[PDB]
Amino acid sequence: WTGQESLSDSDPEMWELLQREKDRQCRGLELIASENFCSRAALEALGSCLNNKYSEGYPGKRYYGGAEVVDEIELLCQRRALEAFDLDPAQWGVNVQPYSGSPANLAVYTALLQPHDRIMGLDLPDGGHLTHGYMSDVKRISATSIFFESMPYKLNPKTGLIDYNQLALTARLFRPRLIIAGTSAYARLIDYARMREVCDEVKAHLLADMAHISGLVAAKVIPSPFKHADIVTTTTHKTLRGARSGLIFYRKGVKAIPYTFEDRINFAVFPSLQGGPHNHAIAAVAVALKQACTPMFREYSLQVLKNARAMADALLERGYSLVSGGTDNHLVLVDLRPKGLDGARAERVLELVSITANKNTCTPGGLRLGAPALTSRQFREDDFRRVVDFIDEGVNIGLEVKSKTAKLQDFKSFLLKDSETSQRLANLRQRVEQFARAFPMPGFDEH
Amino acid sequence: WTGQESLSDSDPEMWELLQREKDRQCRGLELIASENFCSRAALEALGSCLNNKYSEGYPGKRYYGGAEVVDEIELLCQRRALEAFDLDPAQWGVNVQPYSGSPANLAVYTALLQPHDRIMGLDLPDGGHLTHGYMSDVKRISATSIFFESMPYKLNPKTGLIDYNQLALTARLFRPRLIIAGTSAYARLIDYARMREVCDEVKAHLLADMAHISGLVAAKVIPSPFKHADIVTTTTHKTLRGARSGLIFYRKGVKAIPYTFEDRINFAVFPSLQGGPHNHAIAAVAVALKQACTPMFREYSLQVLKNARAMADALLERGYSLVSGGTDNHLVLVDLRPKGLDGARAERVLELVSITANKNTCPGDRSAITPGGLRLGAPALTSRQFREDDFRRVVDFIDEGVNIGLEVKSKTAKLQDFKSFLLKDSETSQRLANLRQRVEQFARAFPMPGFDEH
Amino acid sequence: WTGQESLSDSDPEMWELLQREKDRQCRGLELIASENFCSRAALEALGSCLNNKYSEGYPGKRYYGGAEVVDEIELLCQRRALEAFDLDPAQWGVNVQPYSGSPANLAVYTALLQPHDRIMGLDLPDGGHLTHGYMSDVKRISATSIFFESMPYKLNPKTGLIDYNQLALTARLFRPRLIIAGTSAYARLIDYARMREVCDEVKAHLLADMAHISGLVAAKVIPSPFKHADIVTTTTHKTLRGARSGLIFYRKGVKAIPYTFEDRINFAVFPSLQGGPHNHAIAAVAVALKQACTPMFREYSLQVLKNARAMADALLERGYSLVSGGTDNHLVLVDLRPKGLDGARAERVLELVSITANKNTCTPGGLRLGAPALTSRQFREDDFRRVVDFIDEGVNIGLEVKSKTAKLQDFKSFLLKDSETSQRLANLRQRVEQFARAFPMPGFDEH
Amino acid sequence: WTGQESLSDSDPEMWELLQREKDRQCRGLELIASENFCSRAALEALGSCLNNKYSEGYPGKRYYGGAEVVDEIELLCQRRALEAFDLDPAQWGVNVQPYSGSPANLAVYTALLQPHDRIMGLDLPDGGHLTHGYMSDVKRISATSIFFESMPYKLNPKTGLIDYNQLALTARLFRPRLIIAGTSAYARLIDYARMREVCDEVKAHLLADMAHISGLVAAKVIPSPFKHADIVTTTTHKTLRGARSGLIFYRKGVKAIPYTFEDRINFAVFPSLQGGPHNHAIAAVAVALKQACTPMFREYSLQVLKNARAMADALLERGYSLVSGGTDNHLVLVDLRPKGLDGARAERVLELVSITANKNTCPGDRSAITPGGLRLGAPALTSRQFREDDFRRVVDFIDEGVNIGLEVKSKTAKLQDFKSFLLKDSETSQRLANLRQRVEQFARAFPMPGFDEH
């Protein structure tokens, strides 16, 4: 036993599973706004010998020796991270160790707040993220709401936009120490400048969680939250198209008196929260960041916007309603109530024809659809019009099964069962797949 | 642009860095007890298309669709996890999502305790882990000690063993809700049965953090903490030899009255603490777990023990002292004080001849006091097919380095002086360059798990 | 040494001080709304041999023996407490041990909430109490805000009333576990029914802190918060006219399923927070409660309302503005801004002519004036008109010193200094005193 | 209605209750170590017009006007407080507002610690106070243990003294921010100097809660904790013989660098925790403090010690055991186990013959186990002019009661049985009625501080 044997030879069971998954990805239409397809280059770094180095600490300040190279990698991941977002090193620092997006947010909170200090984020069903704070009537759900004290701010249900006015009123009272600007399911640009005014007034930190939109920001096809925020967090996947990992950016040098984010943020990541860094992820992230500086990436990102517009327009033009009436980014939010349907139903139908989207709250009343993934497969505007055509076939199949049944559980039975419904689906699936398989796919060919 | 281009073509700067690192690993003698070399099979899964699936939730209970296959992978990773540790599914469950070892511990604490509830772990300089709780005189260091209230238990410095007697006395007073049995730098077996008695008495949960020893346990070459613990956490690297990731195991079904670990543990992992699982890691872990069920792995684990013994004996034979006098596991703790040196010096010398070990605090020392010891481990080199004679040879090189360090110390005052002398004094440079080159020539000859080039 | 010697004989220094204080009270016009003059009967109990008994625990469940009598006293204080507020013993319980008003509130919070649980009270400068929660921009001030998490609700600055609408909006978000209805400086009735609707909606406890108005409630000259609240706290002084002490009332027996307030409330008082009860205070309180059941007390309380009305009207009729335009209770809030003055100035002038009132926030812009004390000295409506006349003389002296100076520190100098100001004051003082000394005074004659 | 009418006229029901209580106190033998009988002078201040002034804030810094006189009273109460304990105003400050002893402790903790910070006090059944921290296996009991994190230190059951050695060991681990030296049921002097060494080492505040012994300290018949503590709390009753109220003393001026106790302590009292001060109590306290500076008070305090000795000796002489073998203060702890009885039984018998004492837990016993001991104190009867022979006589009556209890125990099984037999069996009733009547006749003869009638 050398540990040099191939996965296909040593673990055929697992290899078959990887191949089934690759085929599923290759044949399907991926419309989850959070997803993307990672470059082969980045995956080669991810599966490298970098997994075998423990490097607790920071470059030049490691617990253990033998880190010359890993130090260079991490410092390079930092530089590339600052370059990708057009940041001055004298004004901004970055931490590249967080294992994912959620860990990065916790590290910020633990670096800057005391337990039980106050935080505000966009309410979850209004399109925020769990990590921004969330509790039901009966219990604390996010760890953020267990260790800290969170109160949500809300959408204006008329405009579908963030009620900035209510935020200011409500934050004058609750007095949060940290306010979070960033979203999971919102189709428009955030008023970073406004949030900053609110934060300046009540003496709070402004954190921007750009996970969804980091690609768009790096490409400069939308305004940057770095003009206005103290701290920025993000995933390295989603629109940045990297491996799964996380980043924390922070202001440094002179504030007025220095900024004091740097030491606290790094200390909270390590030693307070994490163990050994995942150097193979750090390296893949760095590869993804280099890719994001390119003109190619700017084209990709522009195309992301165009394809989301195109998908929006194609849906309007078939009489669907869109929350906020459209989009200024990479996703669209479809209100299936004025079309006599709901996310739960739609999602399950689409799933069965190899189209993957989310139900989303308004049995909830909406659907979220995103462009970044298919765009990465070189989809253009006509291709997305065609996608909508397939979606609409599926909605109309759904609508038909709803008038022919009562409850959600009923609705799902009727689909796997009634042949006239089964065939209409099998036919549609097969067309979707044939259409999808024809487009290219980032990554390795076989796994 | 397809995103199908190779790393050597698209990012030569990064590719050159990978290659420098691979050459470093190939040419060096890796004695850090936490390290291992991961199989090529596992790394292929890690760098797979599984990176591209969001699967928040659990199998059959996902936020989103399109998870048929990922569900099968995760369930398979679970089964293989239970099988690797010889656990009945009716009695034990497992969560395979934690991103690493440290997150796995936090999830347990948040699942089972209220903020500010009480925890005890082995004091850090006595050989515990940060995640078990740690604060200096002046500040809270571990997030475990910020969100929860931690008090350490200690080694008996006379025996170098864990003072179980003092633990019971001290836990009767402090009244912890969770006691943690597991170590980072301890050369002996833990009395899980005893800890359990203490936990039963004061009404605390017993958590076993087997990160260092999980390989040994899976191979059944040492006793299992699953006989005595309620909850078991571990990394998937170290002696399990997987990709970097984490596991939480927990009792389920009937206690006496049911166990209530399952729902709380899974809930704390997700939705409370984590986002999307890292399915590529989950898959690599599963590959590593399959490998750990094999006879080959049992041979490997036995050999790990024998090589640590052999290294121990070779050090005794040259008049070094070992904390607790030896080892019953994969590591040895070497006391360099009686020999007129310290970990800080030794470590830096060894580093400069491509041997990597840790300085380590010796029992009864207030750290600040520069550490009097060195920790050395067998799992990594054993994975490169080292046998007992190879480790005897490793000790020869170590001893050469110690003796060099000894000479530079007689010619120097302070630690800062000592480090510059190694770079500056040319007679010292050469003696080091000579030794380095012999270490490398010796090391490069042994095989290396992974890919050849990166 | 017997310990039977008189205070005048054994401690002349102290006795002189008591006599100076009694003369000050006898000669002055006491307009602080929180104050009253306690009955001689109640003071005799307060200075009794009951100080010499340790009775930790509750009747029949004492740590120590020899408590037959003290048990009877405490049980009697309970019965009289329930009778005074017209409460059914099967529906309400009471705890009579809290050492004062502030301790009673803490005991409720600690009995019913976890540390860091959420509370809302009327903001302090809007006329709430410290114990309801209070923090500045920079620090936690109330212990309530240290051990628990408090967010204030506010007045509508247009109506001078409590913004019930904003409360509901704001409590839907903050999700408090306890909401507190009660005031220190508010001239109107509280919508207990409305607060209850809000509490029912967000699943919170309603606590009513009737400290200011407990006399009025007992007398049934205003609506009772007992119709709507789960828990009621109060001082035993202020309008109840007792010795300094506190009470906690709580619902008991069947809710729908039993109420669980009783055991938690009593346990928090003792053993959790307090030591030995103050049996002499408990006994004085009981004497005061018996007095409050009488027709005499109902007359007194009606007269309190009439005299506050009369004082209001007399102020309107001299062109002062009143927050909320008047009063439905025992106090009035005078806005000295539309009269070109401020509380800080006015208070100090009045003080120097033996009239005691408070500055109150709108250098703040108001003054609070209360009726209960002077009413207890048998003052009637004409007497209060006459009081206002003296007040107005003082305001007009103030106004004159303001146009003749710059800052507050200046203003205070000018008064003790300039003879033409000094004499005008000495003259006024002497008239005030001569007028006041003529009225009777509850208590002992000499101390 | 003037509110000038007498209590006997306006509330005969209440007046009759006061008179029953006064007769009870006059006729009984009060041996509860916490009790005393307050001077008439102090009670006159307590029931004064000072009840009618709101004076939130501090002298010269009041929310409201009209406080010229109350300011003079409070400042005077401060001066007399410092004088009574022989303290330099440049070195010590005092707060005179706390409503009682328990509030004074809470104010100190809230002034100096963060929520969830760590505190150690003498374990409750080892003779500590609730306010020093206390939790059962299953719940937090003291508010001190809810808002803060408390761990007890313990008696050495072999000596009956405080295990200072174990305190140091245990505090090195738990790392408290505040350690509390003071007791409710302890018969000996506390090693303030030792506690201070322990506090200096681990960087904790030393608080002394002298509630039980403040009279003795003021009289200088025992060593002062002010030589060693940073902060001192006390009640104003117990051995100081005042009205029920509380004090907090604190170091001020230069430490080495200034002390920062003053502003925090005063702020926590008000505005953080309390409302309006109880000026009538403040004035009574001041009266009591003046009385405590006198020679008369020193004689009283000396006599307290002698009478406790005398009671101790009289018990030894009749073959009882005393925890720690005797006393150096105002109380004695009697172990009734070797005599074949327990506190629970003894207490109830003594109660029925108008002698009031406490059952009290004996060292090394898990309470639940019905307490094996009795606590007896001298301050109250000494205030009724009892001398040594009078206390010898008290012990005679106690012993008669013990012997009665012994007979009812041989005729009964359980505690519940034992209590009903005392009411029910007529031969037992009479033996008790006889003894009661002799105790009363003996007690009524001694004078009583206070008013005659109420």
PDB file of N, CA, C and O in Angstrom, chain A residues 237-259:
ATOM      1  N   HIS A 237     -16.867  30.770  -3.146  1.00  0.00           N
ATOM      2  CA  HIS A 237     -17.701  30.171  -4.156  1.00  0.00           C
ATOM      3  C   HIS A 237     -18.839  31.149  -4.599  1.00  0.00           C
ATOM      4  O   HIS A 237     -18.617  32.368  -4.679  1.00  0.00           O
ATOM      5  N   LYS A 238     -20.017  30.627  -4.934  1.00  0.00           N
ATOM      6  CA  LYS A 238     -21.065  31.461  -5.508  1.00  0.00           C
ATOM      7  C   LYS A 238     -20.495  32.202  -6.714  1.00  0.00           C
ATOM      8  O   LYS A 238     -19.786  31.604  -7.490  1.00  0.00           O
ATOM      9  N   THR A 239     -20.773  33.486  -6.875  1.00  0.00           N
ATOM     10  CA  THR A 239     -20.317  34.214  -8.052  1.00  0.00           C
ATOM     11  C   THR A 239     -18.801  34.402  -8.215  1.00  0.00           C
ATOM     12  O   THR A 239     -18.356  34.802  -9.288  1.00  0.00           O
ATOM     13  N   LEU A 240     -18.010  34.185  -7.171  1.00  0.00           N
ATOM     14  CA  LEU A 240     -16.547  34.217  -7.332  1.00  0.00           C
ATOM     15  C   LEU A 240     -16.040  32.968  -7.966  1.00  0.00           C
ATOM     16  O   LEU A 240     -14.913  32.886  -8.446  1.00  0.00           O
ATOM     17  N   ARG A 241     -16.858  31.953  -7.911  1.00  0.00           N
ATOM     18  CA  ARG A 241     -16.592  30.746  -8.688  1.00  0.00           C
ATOM     19  C   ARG A 241     -15.378  29.951  -8.189  1.00  0.00           C
ATOM     20  O   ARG A 241     -14.756  29.239  -8.941  1.00  0.00           O
ATOM     21  N   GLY A 242     -15.080  30.056  -6.900  1.00  0.00           N
ATOM     22  CA  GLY A 242     -13.969  29.350  -6.308  1.00  0.00           C
ATOM     23  C   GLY A 242     -14.372  28.104  -5.589  1.00  0.00           C
ATOM     24  O   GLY A 242     -15.514  27.621  -5.662  1.00  0.00           O
ATOM     25  N   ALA A 243     -13.392  27.539  -4.908  1.00  0.00           N
ATOM     26  CA  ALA A 243     -13.677  26.466  -3.986  1.00  0.00           C
ATOM     27  C   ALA A 243     -14.379  27.020  -2.769  1.00  0.00           C
ATOM     28  O   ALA A 243     -14.270  28.207  -2.424  1.00  0.00           O
ATOM     29  N   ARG A 244     -15.060  26.119  -2.094  1.00  0.00           N
ATOM     30  CA  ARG A 244     -15.701  26.454  -0.828  1.00  0.00           C
ATOM     31  C   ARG A 244     -14.750  26.880   0.264  1.00  0.00           C
ATOM     32  O   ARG A 244     -13.908  26.114   0.720  1.00  0.00           O
ATOM     33  N   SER A 245     -14.886  28.142   0.633  1.00  0.00           N
ATOM     34  CA  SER A 245     -14.041  28.749   1.628  1.00  0.00           C
ATOM     35  C   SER A 245     -14.599  30.133   1.958  1.00  0.00           C
ATOM     36  O   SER A 245     -15.663  30.485   1.490  1.00  0.00           O
ATOM     37  N   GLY A 246     -13.895  30.901   2.777  1.00  0.00           N
ATOM     38  CA  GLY A 246     -14.357  32.207   3.230  1.00  0.00           C
ATOM     39  C   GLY A 246     -13.257  33.237   3.391  1.00  0.00           C
ATOM     40  O   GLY A 246     -12.097  32.891   3.540  1.00  0.00           O
ATOM     41  N   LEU A 247     -13.642  34.509   3.339  1.00  0.00           N
ATOM     42  CA  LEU A 247     -12.725  35.622   3.523  1.00  0.00           C
ATOM     43  C   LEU A 247     -13.301  36.653   4.478  1.00  0.00           C
ATOM     44  O   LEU A 247     -14.512  36.831   4.522  1.00  0.00           O
ATOM     45  N   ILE A 248     -12.440  37.362   5.187  1.00  0.00           N
ATOM     46  CA  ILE A 248     -12.826  38.526   5.956  1.00  0.00           C
ATOM     47  C   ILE A 248     -11.892  39.674   5.593  1.00  0.00           C
ATOM     48  O   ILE A 248     -10.693  39.555   5.762  1.00  0.00           O
ATOM     49  N   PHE A 249     -12.455  40.783   5.092  1.00  0.00           N
ATOM     50  CA  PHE A 249     -11.677  42.018   4.840  1.00  0.00           C
ATOM     51  C   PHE A 249     -11.952  43.049   5.906  1.00  0.00           C
ATOM     52  O   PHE A 249     -13.071  43.155   6.400  1.00  0.00           O
ATOM     53  N   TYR A 250     -10.961  43.867   6.193  1.00  0.00           N
ATOM     54  CA  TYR A 250     -11.103  44.841   7.261  1.00  0.00           C
ATOM     55  C   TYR A 250     -10.274  46.094   7.031  1.00  0.00           C
ATOM     56  O   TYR A 250      -9.181  46.032   6.508  1.00  0.00           O
ATOM     57  N   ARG A 251     -10.779  47.236   7.446  1.00  0.00           N
ATOM     58  CA  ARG A 251     -10.029  48.471   7.265  1.00  0.00           C
ATOM     59  C   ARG A 251      -8.827  48.414   8.167  1.00  0.00           C
ATOM     60  O   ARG A 251      -8.899  47.803   9.218  1.00  0.00           O
ATOM     61  N   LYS A 252      -7.745  49.081   7.791  1.00  0.00           N
ATOM     62  CA  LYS A 252      -6.600  49.234   8.676  1.00  0.00           C
ATOM     63  C   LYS A 252      -5.857  50.551   8.458  1.00  0.00           C
ATOM     64  O   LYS A 252      -6.221  51.329   7.594  1.00  0.00           O
ATOM     65  N   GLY A 253      -4.819  50.782   9.268  1.00  0.00           N
ATOM     66  CA  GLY A 253      -4.109  52.053   9.330  1.00  0.00           C
ATOM     67  C   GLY A 253      -5.003  53.081   9.988  1.00  0.00           C
ATOM     68  O   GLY A 253      -5.831  52.749  10.834  1.00  0.00           O
ATOM     69  N   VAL A 254      -4.890  54.324   9.555  1.00  0.00           N
ATOM     70  CA  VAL A 254      -5.517  55.436  10.264  1.00  0.00           C
ATOM     71  C   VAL A 254      -7.015  55.642   9.976  1.00  0.00           C
ATOM     72  O   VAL A 254      -7.433  55.703   8.826  1.00  0.00           O
ATOM     73  N   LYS A 255      -7.790  55.795  11.051  1.00  0.00           N
ATOM     74  CA  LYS A 255      -9.223  56.048  10.993  1.00  0.00           C
ATOM     75  C   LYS A 255      -9.525  57.540  10.919  1.00  0.00           C
ATOM     76  O   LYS A 255     -10.353  57.949  10.111  1.00  0.00           O
ATOM     77  N   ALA A 256      -8.859  58.336  11.775  1.00  0.00           N
ATOM     78  CA  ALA A 256      -9.158  59.784  11.970  1.00  0.00           C
ATOM     79  C   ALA A 256      -7.913  60.633  12.271  1.00  0.00           C
ATOM     80  O   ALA A 256      -7.199  60.398  13.245  1.00  0.00           O
ATOM     81  N   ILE A 257      -5.455  58.453  15.406  1.00  0.00           N
ATOM     82  CA  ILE A 257      -6.302  57.340  15.858  1.00  0.00           C
ATOM     83  C   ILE A 257      -6.419  56.157  14.849  1.00  0.00           C
ATOM     84  O   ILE A 257      -7.021  56.307  13.768  1.00  0.00           O
ATOM     85  N   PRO A 258      -5.911  54.954  15.221  1.00  0.00           N
ATOM     86  CA  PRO A 258      -5.955  53.836  14.273  1.00  0.00           C
ATOM     87  C   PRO A 258      -7.236  52.969  14.323  1.00  0.00           C
ATOM     88  O   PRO A 258      -7.960  52.949  15.312  1.00  0.00           O
ATOM     89  N   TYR A 259      -7.505  52.278  13.223  1.00  0.00           N
ATOM     90  CA  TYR A 259      -8.489  51.204  13.209  1.00  0.00           C
ATOM     91  C   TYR A 259      -7.917  50.073  14.068  1.00  0.00           C
ATOM     92  O   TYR A 259      -6.696  49.901  14.140  1.00  0.00           O
TER      93      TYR A 259
END
